[PDB]
Amino acid sequence: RPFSVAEVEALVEAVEHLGTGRWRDVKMRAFDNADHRTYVDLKDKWKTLVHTASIAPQQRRGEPVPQDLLDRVLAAHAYWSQQ
């Protein structure tokens, strides 16, 4: 099901801290008790978040993600990409 903003933030925070190649750790960090949120779901969601944050507002679909989160997605994405 759709990620709530809290989950998006939890995911973004986890990715900020863990990067984009440690999905099991991201799961353990922010979705430990969310069986419906597999590490793959998290990886996928992160991918969509990066896309959402990277495209223009008009191109975004689904529930709007708070700008500060999109900004963090891009920053985390940029950091881990540069890493």
From TrEMBL:
<protein>
    <submittedName>
        <fullName>Telomere binding protein TBP1</fullName>
    </submittedName>
</protein>
<feature type="domain" description="HTH myb-type">
    <location>
        <begin position="1"/>
        <end position="54"/>
    </location>
</feature>
<feature type="domain" description="Myb-like">
    <location>
        <begin position="1"/>
        <end position="50"/>
    </location>
</feature>
